[PDB]
A paper describes a structure:
Here, we describe a phage tailspike protein, named K2-2, that specifically depolymerizes the K2 capsular polysaccharide (CPS) of K. pneumoniae into tetrasaccharide repeating units. During the initial stage of infection, the tailspike proteins (TSPs) of bacteriophage recognize specific polysaccharides on the surface of the host cell and attach to them for adsorption. TSPs, also known as polysaccharide depolymerases, have the function of binding and digesting CPS. TSPs typically consist of three domains: an N-terminal particle-binding domain that connects to the tail structure or baseplate of the phage, a receptor-binding domain that extends from the homotrimeric structure and is responsible for host recognition and catalytic activity, and a C-terminal domain that plays a vital role in trimer formation, receptor binding, and intra-molecular chaperone functions.
Before the trimeric wild-type structures were determined using the N-terminally His-tagged protein, the first crystals of K2-2 were, indeed, obtained by using a C-terminally His-tagged protein (termed K2-2C-His). The structure was solved at 2.17 Å resolution by the MAD phasing method under the space group of P63. Unexpectedly, the solved structure revealed four protomers of the enzyme in an asymmetric unit, which formed a tetramer without the presence of a trimer. Specifically, two subunits are assembled into a dimer of a parallel left-handed helix, and two such dimers combine to form a right-handed superhelix. The two dimers superimpose well with each other, and also with any two adjacent subunits in the trimeric wild-type structure, presumably sharing a common interface. Regardless of the different overall organization, individual subunit in the tetrameric structure of K2-2C-His exhibited a conformation nearly identical to that in the trimeric form. The intersubunit carbohydrate-binding groove could be overlaid well with that of the trimeric structure (Cα rmsd = 0.29 Å), including the residues involved in binding the sugar. Notably, as determined by top agar assay, this tetrameric form of K2-2C-His possessed a significant capsule degradation activity towards the K2 K. pneumoniae. Conceivably, although the electron density corresponding to the C-terminal His-tag was not visible in all subunits, the protruding His-tag might give rise to steric hindrance that interfered with the assembly of the enzyme into a trimer. Finally, the structural and functional characterization of the tetrameric form of K2-2 here demonstrates, for the first time in the field of TPSs, that a functional intersubunit catalytic center could be formed without the need for trimerization.
Numbering used by the authors:
A (entry chain A): 148 to 440
B (entry chain D): 16 to 167, 179 to 206, 213 to 440
C (entry chain B): 148 to 166, 179 to 206, 213 to 262, 268 to 578
D (entry chain C): 11 to 293
């Protein structure tokens, strides 16, 4: 129950977490105690003031051994970027960490491209990511692997535009639009190649809005979206045909796979197919240029 | 002094007082690097380079007051940052060459982006790490080559670890030119993760390589490539204590005719040395090691695969063969009309030797070329055994019954 | 950072845990790698609560962490284990005995590894990392290991050690879900990094299979693939690195798209042989003629006109594929031929997305298809057809025609 | 004319004693030792820094405020208080300077002079991080009073990368005339390590250049992981041991690949010789 009011702080970052060692004793000590615990840290949405920097702003003379560092039971609120990955952002674990109401469009959680010695299993357990006023999560770094376990993504979009080899795994997470009338996507893998997004279990909740004019899940060419053990939602406000030209849940020219997915066959409003890549029938869109098949 | 926090602020201000001294705190805002004193000159028409000559927005020149050596930070290079430093290093080198002085690069990591190569003119200036483990990250560079060395002395390149991301079509170092006296050296550099790490082009200068490492290239000729048609490159290419290793499929290939290469105390590890020149290629390795360390791979060490009158000399040094499931092919191969000379070296033997699978008989060297041996030692006390080297060394006539009869 | 120096402790184990605070928390416990001196024993050496070990590091013991007989449910959080003496020193579950690990790091063994040898034993790792160590599973029966969001990597290492080795028993299951498998380039990966023995299973879900030019697993398997062993491999949502400049390889024999892919039938069945007008062309099965000399091979020596060998099987979107072939060209006039992969709908109409690999002229056993025979399954595809074309006057042996379409 | 560009301090002691209070302020150290005119430079005052003091590049004032040296180029020993031509033991200052230099992957330079090395603590050069370079090749190191097992060892801290990238980029030792007094048990240079480590040491491409080792027990001795070292213009002379000029003992691990010597002079006449006893060794 410690609250840190940073409304009058004008620095670039309030907290940074980075080891002073390249190997030992960091390989013995990082895991013994949390780096930050029990702190509710909030600002006043001042431009240029970030909450937490994970790693360092610039590449060090040597590597910084940050593996096994923990941020626990903390909230970062009303900063420009609440949590930002820097160099040497590897094997950090966030347990019961909340990020909310950030100023930047990437303010909830930002992983910029170009990071050195970063990307090994950035883990989040029981974390809450929330906004609704334009801030989102964006993963832009290549060869970056993140795991979210029992986390909540509320009124935000999870953007992945890494050039290559991003892997996001969500186990038991809930994606929801509570209170909001926004048509924003839940997950948007918009660029690069060999990017993988896994939705394993959890729930996808789609509360009614004026009309869902775009697909809530989007996977671009050469990327993969895997749905495992999850129920595909349906609502009468679903109007994804405005974007795609047809009534389907997922957009984009990437690939979707389905394992243990359920449909709401019991929904009075109806049910829709998930993605073009799951088409049962050949020449489904008459893309052959003829009527063959 | 009047103070300006960044080059952008310095250029934007309407400087008007001739001779006035102003202080630049840093080239990039807040970094505290590349700064210094500048003298306003209202008469100067010198070309701006954003380093020693700054041209303000109003056209007034500011001339750097230099107390000491030129640094790339003075031209806007940002060490240990994700920003592209190659324009600043290129501009800094251009100035350095203009005053016939080497460009020193401080120990740090630098990112090279874009697609514009830097051509080092060794008759004017080299690029020298001063001093330690300098890293030049070219993973995002998309040009044909990062560095070229061409005039048409200090080393051209020294103390630099230059690496890419195995992007197809992006080569590390081109010595010479793509199209048709003097001596110059490349020393203490590492080239890593390019398509072709080091490629020979057209050039009349005698190059020497000292303590150069080349590894993990994309191209099958990625370790070191000497293509055919280099008629203008008549000098001997020399290598001293260079390491060509861990190619991940990349190798050395000499394809140029009438071309001579000399390797002294070099190691060729987990790579193949290919020679397929049409005619009159000569490779001499003195005190070198050919080995398959850690991988135990069965790939060939030396493959003189084509042409005629090609000569490969192995003088002293060592040939080491680590055990694998089976050496089903000869590690040395010399094709018809070519020659492999072995001098003062010990031929290895191992129980995993299974060369009869390729040749039909148990021998160390394959191919229909010629092998000669002077002062070669065999492992006569090796418990696994010993084998003959090559058919061309046969003691007995009609050894393979190729006469079509039982004569001799 | 509490530090417990046990370098002079001579007992069998330092800590034991036997019967809701954690049992241990906040302790760096290290020894001097003395034989017979273990760190933590979970349970007793000789034959219903939940207990936890958090925020501890075990280092430089014979066996850092060892499981014993105990009925309590154990959970590990932010536990490090590194640099042990015993080959099973990182973590050892002996035979004759749910164990959960959260964000634990098992690394830098310098010869020590993880070994699960207990039957009917379940282990769950979440967001853990296994670095420069091997995970062995040799349980007699019914061991289960599930890794969700974990990383397996060789950071800074030259070692060719396996990542996962399920080496014995039956009905053992190893699941890899999400996370990453990273293979930094080394002197040459001449053995499979994942191995699943007979009657055992390796499941891969939502994870990207890496590729690197240093992959040389054919040295062990005889063919170019990622996983060895006569067990079974399943994939769901697995991504292949289709745009990797060095190439892509199939994952396992158990995922072969095509029947009689290794010619283990002892014949050429399932392959449609079309000699064309070349009735004189020879297409034969040759026993013990493949890469290892213990497997079948198909020899094709066409006369006057080329011969095409093909096989079609069912497949459908969504899917990704990669194929490798073992090819030995004995002689050829020019390009010996081409291996091609095409897709068709149920009506036989050809679809876009076909790929082909030319065989070239190089003699000797070689891998074909790395950066050519790969891609995405086109939408609407219902059949996949491979075709092996050999040109007239060429004599080529083919073996291990391994295609994988990674999908449920 | 009594104005100065930056606040000036005549010695390291005065710099540390002053209560620095202005964050970011640039101050000038005229010299490490008062009046000597060596080791000076510009320092940036930092009140936020928690970096460990080393009395060279990171200075901690008496009030705890850090002063950070503005360094352009290699590290010099006189930045850490090393004094030319002194009777005081210079090995602690050079060891401290090298420790920082290696920590930032930068070579250590030593100014032209004679230095005395006393005590018994060897300097272990990590060729993957930093070398020790005598300025203009005219550095003399008097080890007559050194009682340790070896003056210098050269061994990498890595088993593979980045040693495969860095070892070749600069020499491990250059421009040093190192001599002892033939006291038994004191060796000059150890190439590799004394004992087999848990992992191998990637020492390939490491260079000793323009150095002389003289009047030691064994001047140059090969240890474990002694592979692909190159010695250029290295001289070994007047050693005590019968194998003192150059000794390769048997039993060495991960050793023997192309140990190379260019323009080296091996001379004695008083009983010391070269002996290669290790198997599978190529020189």
């Amino acid at each position: 129950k410690v609250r840190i009011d940073c409304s009058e702080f004008t620095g670039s970052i309030v907290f940074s977490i980075n080891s002073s060692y390249s190997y030992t004793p960091a390989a013995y000590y990082n895991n013994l105690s949390p780096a930050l615990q029990g702190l509710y840290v909030f600002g006043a949405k001042t431009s240029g003031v970030d909450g937490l920097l994970v790693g360092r702003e610039t590449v060090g003379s040597d590597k910084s051994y940050n593996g096994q560092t923990e941020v626990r039971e903390c909230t970062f609120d009303k900063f420009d970027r609440n949590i930002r990955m820097g160099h040497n952002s590897w094997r950090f674990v966030f347990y019961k960490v909340n990020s909310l109401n950030a100023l930047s469009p990437n303010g909830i959680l930002y992983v910029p491209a170009g990071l050195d010695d970063s990307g090994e299993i950035l883990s989040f357990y029981h974390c809450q990511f929330f906004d609704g006023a334009g801030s989102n999560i964006r993963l832009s770094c290549s060869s970056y692997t993140m795991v979210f376990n029992t986390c909540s993504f509320l009124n935000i979009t999870f953007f992945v535009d890494s050039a290559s080899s991003a892997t996001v795994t969500c186990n038991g997470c809930n994606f929801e639009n509570p209170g909001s009338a926004s048509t924003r996507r839940y997950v948007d893998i918009s660029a690069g190649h060999t990017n993988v997004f896994n939705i394993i279990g959890g729930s996808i909740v789609t509360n009614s809005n004026p009309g869902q004019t775009q697909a809530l899940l989007y996977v671009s060419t050469d990327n993969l979206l895997n749905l495992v053990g999850v129920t595909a939602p349906y609502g009468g406000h679903y109007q994804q045909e405005q974007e795609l030209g047809y009534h389907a849940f997922i957009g984009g020219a990437g690939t979707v796979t389905t394992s243990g997915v359920m449909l709401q066959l019991r929904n009075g409003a109806g049910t829709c197919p998930l993605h073009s890549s799951l088409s049962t029938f050949s020449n489904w869109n008459f893309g052959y240029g003829n009527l063959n098949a | 002094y009047p103070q300006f926090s960044s080059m952008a602020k310095l250029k934007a201000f309407p400087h008007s007082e001739d001779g006035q001294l102003v202080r630049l705190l840093s080239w990039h805002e807040g970094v505290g690097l590349g700064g210094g004193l500048f003298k306003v000159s209202t008469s100067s028409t010198a070309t701006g380079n954003d380093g020693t000559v700054v041209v303000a927005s109003n056209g007034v020149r500011l001339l750097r007051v230099v107390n000491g050596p030129i640094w790339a930070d003075m031209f806007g290079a940002l060490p240990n940052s994700d920003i592209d430093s190659m324009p600043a290093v290129a501009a800094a080198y251009a100035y350095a060459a203009s005053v016939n002085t080497d460009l020193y690069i401080g120990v740090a990591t630098y990112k090279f982006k874009g697609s514009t190569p830097i051509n080092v003119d060794p008759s004017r200036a080299g690029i020298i790490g001063y001093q330690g483990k300098v890293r030049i990250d070219c993973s995002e560079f998309t040009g044909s080559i990062v560095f070229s060395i061409n005039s048409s002395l200090s080393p051209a390149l020294q103390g630099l670890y230059v690496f890419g991301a195995k992007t197809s079509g992006v080569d590390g170092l081109l010595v010479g030119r793509e199209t048709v006296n003097g001596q110059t050296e490349v020393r203490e550099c590492t080239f890593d993760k390019f398509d072709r790490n080091i490629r020979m082009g057209h050039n009349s200068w005698r190059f020497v390589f000292y303590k150069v490492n080349s590894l993990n290239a994309l191209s099958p000729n990625g370790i070191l490539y000497v293509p055919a048609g280099l008629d203008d490159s008549g000098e001997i290419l020399s290598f001293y204590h260079c390491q060509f290793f861990d190619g991940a499929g990349s190798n050395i290939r000499l394809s140029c005719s009438s071309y001579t290469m000399v390797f002294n105390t070099c190691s060729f590890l987990n790579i193949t040395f290919f020679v397929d020149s049409a005619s009159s290629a000569t490779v001499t390795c003195n005190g070198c090691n050919f080995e398959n360390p850690g991988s135990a791979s069965t790939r060939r060490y030396v493959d003189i695969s084509a042409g005629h009158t090609n000569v490969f000399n192995i003088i002293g040094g060592s040939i080491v063969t680590n055990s694998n499931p089976g050496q089903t092919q000869a590690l040395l191969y010399v094709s018809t009309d070519n020659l492999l000379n072995l001098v003062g070296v010990t031929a290895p033997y191992g129980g995993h030797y299974q060369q009869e699978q390729e040749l039909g008989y148990h021998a160390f060297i394959g191919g229909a070329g010629t092998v000669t041996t002077s002062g070669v030692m065999l492992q006569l006390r090796n418990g696994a055994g010993t084998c003959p080297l090559h058919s061309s060394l046969s003691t007995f006539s009609n050894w393979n019954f190729g006469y079509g009869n039982l004569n001799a | 950072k509490v530090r417990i120096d046990c370098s002079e402790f001579t007992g069998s184990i330092v800590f034991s845990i036997n019967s809701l605070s954690p049992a241990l928390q906040g302790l760096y416990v290290f020894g001097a790698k003395t034989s017979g001196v273990d760190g933590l024993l979970v349970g007793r050496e000789t034959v219903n609560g939940q207990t936890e070990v958090r925020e501890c590091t075990f280092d430089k013991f014979d066996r850092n962490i060892r499981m014993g007989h105990n009925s309590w449910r154990f959970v590990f959080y932010k536990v490090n284990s590194l640099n042990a003496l015993s080959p099973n020193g990182i973590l050892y579950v002996p035979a004759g005995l749910i164990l959960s690990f959260y964000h634990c790091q098992f690394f830098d063994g310098a010869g020590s590894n993880i070994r699960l040898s207990c039957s009917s034993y379940t282990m769950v790792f979440n967001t853990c990392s296994f670095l420069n160590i091997t995970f062995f599973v040799d349980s007699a029966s019914s061991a289960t290991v599930t890794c969700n969001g974990c990383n397996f990597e060789n950071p800074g290492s030259a070692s060719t050690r396996r990542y996962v080795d399920i080496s014995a028993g039956h009905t053992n299951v190893f699941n890899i879900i999400g996370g990453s498998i990273v293979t930094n380039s080394n002197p040459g990966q001449t053995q499979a990094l994942l191995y699943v023995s007979t009657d055992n299973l390796l499941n891969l879900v939502g994870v990207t299979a890496p590729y690197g030019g240093h992959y040389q697993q054919e040295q062990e398997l005889g063919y170019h693939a990622f996983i060895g062993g006569a067990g079974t491999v399943t994939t769901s949502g697995v991504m292949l690195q289709l745009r990797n400049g060095a190439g892509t390889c199939p994952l396992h024999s158990s995922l072969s798209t095509f029947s009689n892919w290794n010619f283990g039938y002892g014949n050429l069945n399932a392959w449609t042989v079309d000699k064309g007008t070349g009735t004189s062309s020879v297409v034969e099965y040759l026993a013990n003629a493949g890469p290892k000399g213990t497997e079948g091979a198909m020899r094709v020596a066409p006369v006057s006109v080329g011969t095409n060998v093909s096989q079609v099987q069912a497949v459908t979107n969504p899917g990704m594929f990669s194929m490798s072939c073992m090819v030995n060209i004995a002689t050829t006039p020019g390009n010996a031929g081409q291996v091609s992969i095409g897709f068709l709908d149920a009506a036989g109409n050809s679809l876009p997305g076909g790929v082909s690999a030319n065989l070239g002229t190089t003699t000797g056993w070689q891998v074909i298809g790395k950066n050519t025979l790969r891609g995405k399954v086109p939408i609407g595809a219902k059949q996949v057809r491979v075709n092996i074309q050999t040109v007239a006057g060429a004599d080529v042996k083919y073996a291990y025609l391994l295609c994988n379409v990674v999908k449920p | 004319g009594y104005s100065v560009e930056y606040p000036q301090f005549s010695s390291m002691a005065k710099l540390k004693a002053f209560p620095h209070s202005e964050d970011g302020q640039l101050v000038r150290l005229l010299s490490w030792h008062e009046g000597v005119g060596l080791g000076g430079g510009l320092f940036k005052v930092s009140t936020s820094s928690t970096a460990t003091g080393n009395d060279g590049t990171v200075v901690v004032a008496s009030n705890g405020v850090r002063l950070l040296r503005v360094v352009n180029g290699p590290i010099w020993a006189d930045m850490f208080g090393a004094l030319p031509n002194s009777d005081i033991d210079s090995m602690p200052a050079v060891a401290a300077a090298y420790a920082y230099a290696a920590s930032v992957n930068t070579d250590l330079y030593i100014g032209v002079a004679t230095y005395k090395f006393k005590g018994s603590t060897p300097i272990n050069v990590d060729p993957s991080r930093a070398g020790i370079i005598g300025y203009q090749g005219k550095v003399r190191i008097d080890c007559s009073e050194f009682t340790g097992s070896i003056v210098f060892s050269i061994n990498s801290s890595y088993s593979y990368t980045p040693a495969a990238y860095y070892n070749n980029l600069s020499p491990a030792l250059q421009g040093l005339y190192v001599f002892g007094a033939k006291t038994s048990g004191v060796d000059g240079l150890l190439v590799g390590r004394e004992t087999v480590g848990s992992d191998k040491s990637y020492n390939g491409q490491t260079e000793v250049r323009e150095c002389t080792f003289d009047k030691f027990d064994r001047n140059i001795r090969m240890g474990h992981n002694s592979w692909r070292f190159v010695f250029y213009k290295v001289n070994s002379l007047n050693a005590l041991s019968p194998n003192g000029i150059l000794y390769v003992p048997a039993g060495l691990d991960d050793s023997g690949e192309i140990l190379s010597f260019y323009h080296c002079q091996f001379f004695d006449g008083a009983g010391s010789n070269i002996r290669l006893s290790c198997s599978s060794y190529t020189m």
